[PDB]
Scaffold this motif. Structure first.
Motif, PDB file in Angstrom:
ATOM      1  N   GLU A  72       0.866  -1.188   0.000  1.00 13.43           N
ATOM      2  CA  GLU A  72       0.000   0.000   0.000  1.00 13.43           C
ATOM      3  C   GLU A  72       0.903   1.238   0.000  1.00 13.43           C
ATOM      4  O   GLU A  72       1.987   1.241   0.627  1.00 13.43           O
ATOM      5  CB  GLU A  72      -0.887   0.067   1.255  1.00 13.43           C
ATOM      6  CG  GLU A  72      -2.060  -0.914   1.276  1.00 13.43           C
ATOM      7  CD  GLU A  72      -1.668  -2.335   1.734  1.00 13.43           C
ATOM      8  OE1 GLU A  72      -0.462  -2.580   2.012  1.00 13.43           O
ATOM      9  OE2 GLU A  72      -2.585  -3.196   1.805  1.00 13.43           O
TER      10      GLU A  72
ATOM     11  N   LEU B  11       0.726   3.891   1.660  1.00 13.01           N
ATOM     12  CA  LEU B  11       1.010   4.392   3.026  1.00 13.01           C
ATOM     13  C   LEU B  11       2.297   3.761   3.584  1.00 13.01           C
ATOM     14  O   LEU B  11       3.111   4.432   4.258  1.00 13.01           O
ATOM     15  CB  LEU B  11      -0.155   4.088   3.979  1.00 13.01           C
ATOM     16  CG  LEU B  11       0.029   4.303   5.494  1.00 13.01           C
ATOM     17  CD1 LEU B  11       0.430   5.748   5.855  1.00 13.01           C
ATOM     18  CD2 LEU B  11      -1.284   3.903   6.158  1.00 13.01           C
TER      19      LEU B  11
ATOM     20  N   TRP C 238      -8.721   2.266  -1.550  1.00 11.56           N
ATOM     21  CA  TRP C 238      -7.883   2.705  -0.441  1.00 11.56           C
ATOM     22  C   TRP C 238      -8.581   2.490   0.906  1.00 11.56           C
ATOM     23  O   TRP C 238      -9.772   2.744   1.034  1.00 11.56           O
ATOM     24  CB  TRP C 238      -7.572   4.213  -0.578  1.00 11.56           C
ATOM     25  CG  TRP C 238      -6.900   4.615  -1.847  1.00 11.56           C
ATOM     26  CD1 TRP C 238      -7.468   4.701  -3.086  1.00 11.56           C
ATOM     27  CD2 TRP C 238      -5.525   4.976  -2.014  1.00 11.56           C
ATOM     28  NE1 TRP C 238      -6.532   5.097  -4.014  1.00 11.56           N
ATOM     29  CE2 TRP C 238      -5.330   5.272  -3.383  1.00 11.56           C
ATOM     30  CE3 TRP C 238      -4.437   5.082  -1.142  1.00 11.56           C
ATOM     31  CZ2 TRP C 238      -4.082   5.669  -3.904  1.00 11.56           C
ATOM     32  CZ3 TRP C 238      -3.189   5.477  -1.662  1.00 11.56           C
ATOM     33  CH2 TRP C 238      -3.032   5.765  -3.037  1.00 11.56           C
ATOM     34  N   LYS C 239      -7.863   2.020   1.915  1.00  7.87           N
ATOM     35  CA  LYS C 239      -8.490   1.854   3.224  1.00  7.87           C
ATOM     36  C   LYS C 239      -8.669   3.281   3.757  1.00  7.87           C
ATOM     37  O   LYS C 239      -7.741   4.102   3.669  1.00  7.87           O
ATOM     38  CB  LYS C 239      -7.582   1.051   4.168  1.00  7.87           C
ATOM     39  CG  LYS C 239      -7.374  -0.418   3.755  1.00  7.87           C
ATOM     40  CD  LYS C 239      -6.482  -1.187   4.742  1.00  7.87           C
ATOM     41  CE  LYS C 239      -5.120  -0.510   4.944  1.00  7.87           C
ATOM     42  NZ  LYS C 239      -4.149  -1.272   5.821  1.00  7.87           N
ATOM     43  N   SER C 240      -9.835   3.578   4.324  1.00  8.34           N
ATOM     44  CA  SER C 240     -10.065   4.921   4.815  1.00  8.34           C
ATOM     45  C   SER C 240      -8.983   5.390   5.791  1.00  8.34           C
ATOM     46  O   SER C 240      -8.550   6.537   5.688  1.00  8.34           O
ATOM     47  CB  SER C 240     -11.485   5.053   5.424  1.00  8.34           C
ATOM     48  OG  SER C 240     -11.511   4.659   6.793  1.00  8.34           O
ATOM     49  N   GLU C 241      -8.511   4.525   6.700  1.00  4.97           N
ATOM     50  CA  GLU C 241      -7.453   4.918   7.662  1.00  4.97           C
ATOM     51  C   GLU C 241      -6.175   5.319   6.930  1.00  4.97           C
ATOM     52  O   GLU C 241      -5.420   6.206   7.372  1.00  4.97           O
ATOM     53  CB  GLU C 241      -7.092   3.770   8.607  1.00  4.97           C
ATOM     54  CG  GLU C 241      -8.264   2.895   9.027  1.00  4.97           C
ATOM     55  CD  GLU C 241      -8.601   1.794   8.017  1.00  4.97           C
ATOM     56  OE1 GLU C 241      -7.725   0.939   7.730  1.00  4.97           O
ATOM     57  OE2 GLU C 241      -9.749   1.779   7.520  1.00  4.97           O
ATOM     58  N   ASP C 242      -5.916   4.640   5.813  1.00  5.69           N
ATOM     59  CA  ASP C 242      -4.724   4.939   4.994  1.00  5.69           C
ATOM     60  C   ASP C 242      -4.821   6.388   4.460  1.00  5.69           C
ATOM     61  O   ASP C 242      -3.886   7.192   4.609  1.00  5.69           O
ATOM     62  CB  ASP C 242      -4.618   3.931   3.824  1.00  5.69           C
ATOM     63  CG  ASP C 242      -3.889   2.607   4.217  1.00  5.69           C
ATOM     64  OD1 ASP C 242      -3.649   2.370   5.430  1.00  5.69           O
ATOM     65  OD2 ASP C 242      -3.568   1.805   3.297  1.00  5.69           O
TER      66      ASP C 242
ATOM     67  N   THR D 294      -6.548   8.779   5.589  1.00  7.01           N
ATOM     68  CA  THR D 294      -6.353   9.686   6.686  1.00  7.01           C
ATOM     69  C   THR D 294      -4.901   9.865   7.044  1.00  7.01           C
ATOM     70  O   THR D 294      -4.407  11.003   7.143  1.00  7.01           O
ATOM     71  CB  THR D 294      -7.122   9.240   7.919  1.00  7.01           C
ATOM     72  OG1 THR D 294      -8.474   8.960   7.537  1.00  7.01           O
ATOM     73  CG2 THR D 294      -7.106  10.350   8.985  1.00  7.01           C
ATOM     74  N   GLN D 295      -4.195   8.749   7.214  1.00  7.04           N
ATOM     75  CA  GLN D 295      -2.788   8.850   7.591  1.00  7.04           C
ATOM     76  C   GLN D 295      -1.913   9.486   6.533  1.00  7.04           C
ATOM     77  O   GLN D 295      -0.972  10.209   6.850  1.00  7.04           O
ATOM     78  CB  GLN D 295      -2.253   7.485   7.974  1.00  7.04           C
ATOM     79  CG  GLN D 295      -2.891   6.962   9.244  1.00  7.04           C
ATOM     80  CD  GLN D 295      -2.408   5.566   9.563  1.00  7.04           C
ATOM     81  OE1 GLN D 295      -1.230   5.381   9.883  1.00  7.04           O
ATOM     82  NE2 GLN D 295      -3.298   4.568   9.445  1.00  7.04           N
TER      83      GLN D 295
ATOM     84  N   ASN E 289      -0.438  12.506   8.214  1.00  5.19           N
ATOM     85  CA  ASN E 289       0.945  12.341   8.583  1.00  5.19           C
ATOM     86  C   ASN E 289       2.031  12.567   7.542  1.00  5.19           C
ATOM     87  O   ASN E 289       3.189  12.729   7.916  1.00  5.19           O
ATOM     88  CB  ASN E 289       1.088  10.986   9.277  1.00  5.19           C
ATOM     89  CG  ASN E 289       0.081  10.826  10.409  1.00  5.19           C
ATOM     90  OD1 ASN E 289      -0.166  11.776  11.149  1.00  5.19           O
ATOM     91  ND2 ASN E 289      -0.506   9.643  10.544  1.00  5.19           N
TER      92      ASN E 289
ATOM     93  N   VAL F 179     -12.397  14.475   5.511  1.00  4.12           N
ATOM     94  CA  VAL F 179     -11.012  14.215   5.909  1.00  4.12           C
ATOM     95  C   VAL F 179     -10.003  15.060   5.157  1.00  4.12           C
ATOM     96  O   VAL F 179      -9.043  15.576   5.767  1.00  4.12           O
ATOM     97  CB  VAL F 179     -10.573  12.765   5.681  1.00  4.12           C
ATOM     98  CG1 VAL F 179      -9.414  12.442   6.621  1.00  4.12           C
ATOM     99  CG2 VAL F 179     -11.717  11.829   5.884  1.00  4.12           C
TER     100      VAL F 179
ATOM    101  N   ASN G 251      -8.589  -5.569  -0.156  1.00  2.57           N
ATOM    102  CA  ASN G 251      -9.517  -4.789   0.659  1.00  2.57           C
ATOM    103  C   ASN G 251     -10.955  -5.291   0.603  1.00  2.57           C
ATOM    104  O   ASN G 251     -11.778  -4.934   1.442  1.00  2.57           O
ATOM    105  CB  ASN G 251      -9.475  -3.312   0.246  1.00  2.57           C
ATOM    106  CG  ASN G 251      -8.132  -2.660   0.529  1.00  2.57           C
ATOM    107  OD1 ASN G 251      -7.457  -2.978   1.515  1.00  2.57           O
ATOM    108  ND2 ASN G 251      -7.753  -1.723  -0.326  1.00  2.57           N
TER     109      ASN G 251
END
Ligand SMILES: NC(=O)c1ccc[n+]([C@@H]2O[C@H](COP(=O)([O-])OP(=O)(O)OC[C@H]3O[C@@H](n4cnc5c(N)ncnc54)[C@H](O)[C@@H]3O)[C@@H](O)[C@H]2O)c1
Ligand SMILES: NC(=O)c1ccc[n+]([C@@H]2O[C@H](COP(=O)([O-])OP(=O)(O)OC[C@H]3O[C@@H](n4cnc5c(N)ncnc54)[C@H](O)[C@@H]3O)[C@@H](O)[C@H]2O)c1
Ligand SMILES: NC(=O)c1ccc[n+]([C@@H]2O[C@H](COP(=O)([O-])OP(=O)(O)OC[C@H]3O[C@@H](n4cnc5c(N)ncnc54)[C@H](O)[C@@H]3O)[C@@H](O)[C@H]2O)c1
Ligand SMILES: NC(=O)c1ccc[n+]([C@@H]2O[C@H](COP(=O)([O-])OP(=O)(O)OC[C@H]3O[C@@H](n4cnc5c(N)ncnc54)[C@H](O)[C@@H]3O)[C@@H](O)[C@H]2O)c1
Ligand SMILES: NC(=O)c1ccc[n+]([C@@H]2O[C@H](COP(=O)([O-])OP(=O)(O)OC[C@H]3O[C@@H](n4cnc5c(N)ncnc54)[C@H](O)[C@@H]3O)[C@@H](O)[C@H]2O)c1
Ligand SMILES: NC(=O)c1ccc[n+]([C@@H]2O[C@H](COP(=O)([O-])OP(=O)(O)OC[C@H]3O[C@@H](n4cnc5c(N)ncnc54)[C@H](O)[C@@H]3O)[C@@H](O)[C@H]2O)c1
Ligand SMILES: [Xe]
Ligand SMILES: [Xe]
Ligand SMILES: [Xe]
Ligand SMILES: [Xe]
Ligand SMILES: [Xe]
Ligand SMILES: [Xe]
Ligand SMILES: [Xe]
Ligand SMILES: [Xe]
Ligand SMILES: [Xe]
Ligand SMILES: [Xe]
Ligand SMILES: [Xe]
Ligand SMILES: [Xe]
Ligand SMILES: [Xe]
Ligand SMILES: [Xe]
Ligand SMILES: [Xe]
Lengths: 231, 232, 231, 232, 231, 231
Positions: free
Chosen positions: F89, F91, F125-129, F131-132, F136, F158, F229
């Motif tokens: 991924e 990320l 894409w994983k939503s947390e990805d 976000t990060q 970040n 987001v 996913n």
């Protein structure tokens, strides 16, 4: 100079000044190149077995087509396809007319951009049919969106490979007289004079051919090509 | 129900299936509202004194106009305007045809396309009091494929907005801009115009070899009558 | 002159200056034609049984709509619909009010192009409801996309047939202020001053009305009309 | 963090909800960058010598703005410009306000829309050095529903591009186009402008019949002050 | 199979990847028709007498064009036009090259849509010139706005008449690396790497060729063709 | 001034002048803000486990990328992803490079609008990805459609929340040299010179890398992210 015959396969439900206009456009264009001589135009209404929603009897479509071409010197109607019990792929209709002419002018498919672009509709056309149509006969595609047609050809390796046999003819007089809008008009009782030939308008009124009822025919039924190519 | 006469003032150089179509559309609209009854359609070709570039001699235009309407039960051609010596303001043509009908009277309404409506904005093209009287004392039936544009144009004008009830915008959903210009160009190039004009008009043009580079240059460099007059 | 009552069914989640503006425009238009007299405007918030995503509780939406019209001399809120246990078809709300009157002004549905066009969403509106709504009551569609609305009407036989009872009102001062954008701005802490009435704004702030949480309401649930015309 | 004062120079003929939103949006944007703190907003109606077509007396436009901001905790009206017998260049108004603040000092930035920014290209409207000093020494906060166009405009101008760090384009996602011109047109036609301008403003306007055919004619045929002066 | 020389007149101020790309596209198209063989490409920079605004000295432009084509196997620079004292009509530059060959491949003008369309700018081209170019040589117009180029040809009697000697080549891979944008980028110190050949880029950097000053060149001066055809 | 490393993850199938431009633009923009210093550029070709339709072997893509940056002073090729037997991924790729640097410049994902917008493709894409990535690390998105990218950001809570980490860079010199169009041109024997670096075109030519066959690689296979996913 290659002698050419323009074969237009379609529903002509009903034929309009635009369908006739198609033939005029293609001819001026092909003759214009200098490498061709358009010898005949053939209208070939699809058989009722096509099962297109709102399609009236082929008998009326032929008559209208005949009335529409009554005064035309070079364009005429061929009823072979319509009198067929089974729905015939356009390749076969092209073939039939080529073989006929050998009893030699080349037969080209006369169409609009919608027809050409329908090549992409999943299962609507056997891919070999596409190859053979453009490879062995060729298309003369008339359109007001020359670039979308050109773009569609450019995006397909097959169409691009046989691009010399696909001729995009620009229609600079924004003709939008579609069969659907003609039918809508009649159902609402509006005039369609000057959108179709007088005899066709007169024939339609006299028998009130189009209506909510007629528009409903084949409703719920799969289009012939789609059924045959999935079955 | 009000009886009404649609009067289309134009150059008709040449007339085409689209001008004929304008009349059919407008009549359907009017009768369809439920409050009118269209009784007659009048095509009034503009006099040669208009001096529009490429405008061929008024007599040929009247004939094609008559040929195109030979089988028209309700539309006819009027030559009064073309026969006049000076160019005639559309308001006067309308008046002339209204006075003429008063001889329970039907009302004359100016029938046109969006281009004519919008031309009201061209400086010195139309006397402002003329616009006022046209929309107030007669009215406009404006056919067009750009409905919002006509509505917007009307909305942006105090005089038009004010007499908005006497201005009817009719939508042409079946677009087909068979313009005279493109017909003239097609002819100059020997292209077919069959099915763009009525058969008899096509043939008439054929036989008399009406349009060419030469005809298209007529009036080249001459100021349009209205503009010439309204500036003097 | 026909007296008329403008009725707008909607979610008003939350009501904005745009909704109030809608009423002003329709009134100016109807009174402007010279043949109608708008005697009242009615805002009828939809009940929670509607199950639309993000729909906060009815009482909050009623109160806000009431706060919004407190300073209107002619527009008011009606809570009938929102108090029913089962979601109610707009034809039913129109009928309720028309009858309640006959105890006579004509009730007409006030809406944007949006709702007009949702008539096409599969299974959203019963086809007889649409016919009855346009034929028996009427529609005042206020929109920026007038040609889109006119076109939609033209493309449907029922609407075209009852077009004399359908009025498209051009919104020349294009304002947007959609509820969706207002909730979005609130979630982000952005100012909504001047987009909704001060009283509404103040209420929204007092109860911290909109959030990511509120936005998930009925997440996954199937909108009542759909659940019902399907199930 | 740089404290900022948003100064909006304009006609406000009349002030509408759109002008008020403008301040809200720009405040949110500037504060949201994490690097600015908007401390005050200033509405500055132009004096009558600007000579714009349809511009009503300055005193009324000033009163409408004060009525409009009666309930604002941070936006206020400044009359300096409305009291000048000779029309003042925006750069001079910017300087006037900055010099005023100077009497840790907040920076005055011009708040405007895309129309004012792109007006920099109208021949003779703005002295080229004025455009330069405004963007280099003060700054613009341009709010608009057409962000790419404003960026394109900036990109196409060597001076604007050079000082692009001082030009903030602010997207207006909730489209708003309550122009003063459409408000006056509405009023001439007796249409409702409720909810498009604050209630006190609508009420003041209705009470004194400020906008009409006649008011719209003010300064007709007259040349806008900047143009006259920059062509002299 | 007709042999052809593609001649491109222009300012090449500076030449860029797109001007080079133009030649590749035209060649692939012409050879692809199966009836042409492109034996050579010629870049003819315009002389300083043209007086176009921002136009830097010819010697720099000629040199950059040679650096650009150093690595080309078939495209080269021709300095004739630029060595003349008086600005030269494009038809003359064409006639020149055609005669120099007759000492036989047919020379055709290679251009973008801009140039084709500037045929309509008042006083910019002598009409006899337009007619001789398309009638006696040919135009290969490469462009992203294919339909516009086609519309422009359709709207001109002269161009339409000789349309067979005009080929619009579609550029499906959009490029818009205009010289103006390159100059603008150079004035602001932005990178132009990968927009122009490395050697051109290096040349431009070494001689600091583009700036606000250079952009001022010929400011206020009337472009040579307008001056001539007018006075 | 924060030092920054531009990391472009992509297929580079094949790399073109446009990907190289992406780096020039992004660098001029970040250094242009006056608050960043671009210290390095990293091209990171995806591994074959990604399974994208038409993806040729990673080794070749890596070589073409090395050839393209041979003469680049600051853009290099990192092969980590290409050597992963399991598709990684983005990320993780960002995290791999960030820790590597911590062995302190900040790594930011360089991409175009397509990639950014692909964030909305269901299951890509994983939503947390997402976000990060924007919380970040940051994204530098280069595009011809800035408003579209800006609107895409505005419509996502987001993205909007971390909008200060997403820099939209306008590409005023429109260039659309997509890999898909490059491969199309190659299959058709068309020149791709001046669209990709000379060494790259030569490597492709010498090995006949792109063909109808190559284009079928992975046909019918599900893209790694979707498969993973969804599973
Ligand atoms: N062989 C197959 O697999 C296959 C599959 C689908 C359809 N078909 C054939 O295609 C035809 C379908 O015809 P249809 O239902 O669309 O007929 P139609 O009557 O609507 O149109 C006839 C022709 O006019 C063209 N046309 C329509 N409007 C035009 C305009 N404004 N400008 C230019 N051209 C315009 C159409 O593209 C078409 O080629 C039938 O003959 C059918 O058998 C064949
Ligand atoms: N009284 C005045 O001051 C004044 C000033 C200018 C013009 N005029 C009058 O206006 C007329 C100008 O006519 P013209 O030269 O444009 O005539 P025309 O022959 O080109 O057009 C005739 C009519 O067709 C309409 N039309 C054309 N294409 C249309 C389409 N696609 N859809 C709908 N409608 C369409 C035109 O709007 C016009 O009303 C003349 O009669 C002239 O005397 C009057
Ligand atoms: N009877 C049925 O079958 C059926 C099916 C679906 C929906 N409905 C009804 O429709 C309503 C759905 O409302 P909603 O959630 O969209 O309400 P809403 O709060 O979003 O909007 C209320 C009204 O504002 C209009 N509007 C919004 N922005 C506008 C603008 N810029 N210009 C013009 N008009 C604008 C909308 O089209 C609508 O008429 C409910 O009352 C629901 O019960 C009925
Ligand atoms: N110094 C100079 O040379 C010079 C030259 C011309 C004008 N000016 C100044 O410019 C001002 C002219 O103001 P005006 O007549 O346009 O005032 P106005 O009242 O119409 O507008 C005020 C502001 O609203 C903005 N705006 C309007 N609609 C908007 C929308 N939908 N979204 C966002 N912003 C929007 C406008 O762009 C403007 O900045 C005066 O202060 C004048 O003195 C100065
Ligand atoms: N004979 C005459 O009367 C006359 C009048 C005017 C101009 N001209 C000639 O025309 C030329 C003008 O050249 P210029 O200054 O515009 O040259 P230029 O350097 O900007 O461009 C060179 C060529 O590239 C083409 N081009 C540029 N960008 C393109 C793109 N994205 N896609 C496709 N093609 C593109 C242009 O159309 C032109 O043909 C000169 O040779 C001049 O002498 C002749
Ligand atoms: N972590 C995840 O869930 C996830 C999901 C999907 C994809 N990805 C990653 O995304 C990448 C997908 O790359 P691809 O196949 O689209 O790469 P590609 O080779 O086609 O292009 C590489 C980059 O160029 C940009 N680009 C292309 N044309 C452009 C133009 N005209 N202007 C500006 N920028 C332009 C693209 O948007 C992309 O960022 C891979 O690294 C893949 O692993 C990650
Ligand atoms: Xe057609
Ligand atoms: Xe007409
Ligand atoms: Xe028409
Ligand atoms: Xe509403
Ligand atoms: Xe509204
Ligand atoms: Xe209330
Ligand atoms: Xe519908
Ligand atoms: Xe605004
Ligand atoms: Xe003053
Ligand atoms: Xe500018
Ligand atoms: Xe190009
Ligand atoms: Xe070129
Ligand atoms: Xe790019
Ligand atoms: Xe691997
Ligand atoms: Xe997203």
């Amino acid at each position: 100079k290659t002698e050419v015959v323009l074969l237009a396969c379609g529903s002509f439900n009903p034929i309009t000044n635009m369908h006739l206009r198609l033939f005029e456009l293609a001819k001026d264009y092909m003759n214009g190149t200098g490498r061709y001589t358009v010898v005949k135009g053939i209208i070939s209404p699809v058989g009722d077995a096509y099962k297109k929603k709102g399609l009236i009897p082929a008998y009326h479509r032929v008559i209208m087509a005949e009335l529409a071409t009554k005064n035309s010197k070079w364009v005429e109607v061929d009823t072979w396809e319509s009198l067929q019990k089974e729905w015939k792929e356009t390749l076969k209709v092209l073939r039939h007319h080529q073989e006929k002419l050998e009893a030699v002018p080349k037969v080209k498919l006369l169409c609009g951009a919608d027809l050409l672009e329908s090549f992409a509709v999943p299962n609507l056309w056997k891919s070999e049919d596409i190859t053979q149509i453009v490879a062995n006969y060729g298309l003369i595609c008339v359109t007001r969106a020359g670039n979308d047609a050109q773009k569609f050809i450019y995006e397909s390796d097959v169409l691009w490979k046989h691009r010399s046999n696909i001729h995009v003819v620009n229609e600079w007089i924004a003709n939008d007289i579609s069969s659907t809008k003609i039918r809508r008009a009649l159902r609402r009782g509006q005039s369609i004079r000057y959108l179709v030939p007088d005899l066709v308008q007169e024939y339609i009124e006299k028998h009130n051919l189009y209506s909510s009822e007629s528009e409903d025919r084949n409703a719920g039924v799969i289009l012939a090509p789609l059924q045959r190519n999935t079955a």
